[PDB]
Copies of this chain bind each other. A is one copy, B any other.
Amino acid sequence: DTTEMYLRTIYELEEEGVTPLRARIAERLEQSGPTVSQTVARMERDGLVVVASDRSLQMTPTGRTLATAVMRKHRLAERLLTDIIGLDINKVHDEACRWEHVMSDEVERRLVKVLKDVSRSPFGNPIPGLDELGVPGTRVIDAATSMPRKVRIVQINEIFQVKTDQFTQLLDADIRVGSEVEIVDRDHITLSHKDVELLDDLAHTIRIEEL
């Protein structure tokens, strides 16, 4: 389904921290602007995407769920193809781009059993959706949900910190008040600008807003 290829392309552009504009989508899929526009209209009617006022495509909860599953199948296919089949690594991504459309959930569950590790694709990116498969401003500690979000730093509050080893890590990552960074919760909290895994005191006292 062309729908799956559009949703996965949006997913991938978002992971790369690129705004999912229609022209970006068109260019990545090697499809015309007008063709992309016609497909985006069908996808809005289907409830999978909305076109935001800055013209970027924002996937709905349903659109995002489907996108996520397509990416999971793509990445599990890449692991099968490299770890077990041994297809030349230069061909693995293009093979998996086809296989992601035809792999059942049942095969994915089997792949999770058989593969050594399903943490990441061979190309370094996390395999999403495995839980779904079945097996002032605000303080960063609070504002962080569990999926990555771009936010703006308002206070770092160095003056209140007892532990200071991360001051330089923040500097080396160019995180200052004003920096736009992506924040994430884990099984410990993390900032992206480089990746800084915050100890609790900092996570409790650094503040983030959003425009």
Q: Is A84 interfacial (CB-CB < 8 Å)?
A: yes
Interface residue from B84, B91, B102, B114 paired with A106 (Cβ < 8 Å): B91
Q: Mark A113-128, 1 if CB is under 8 A from B, else 0.
A: 1100000000000000
Q: Which of A93-101, A156-164, A186-194 contacts B (4 or more CB under 8 A)?
A: A93-101
Interface residue from B85, B102, B104, B114 paired with A102 (Cβ < 8 Å): B102
Q: Is A107 interfacial (CB-CB < 8 Å)?
A: yes
Are A95 and B104 within 8 A (Cβ)?
yes
Q: Is A110 interfacial (CB-CB < 8 Å)?
A: yes
Are A85 and B99 within 8 A (Cβ)?
no
Q: Which 7 A-B pairs have the closest CB atoms?
A: A98-B102, A85-B110, A86-B110, A87-B107, A87-B110, A102-B102, A99-B102
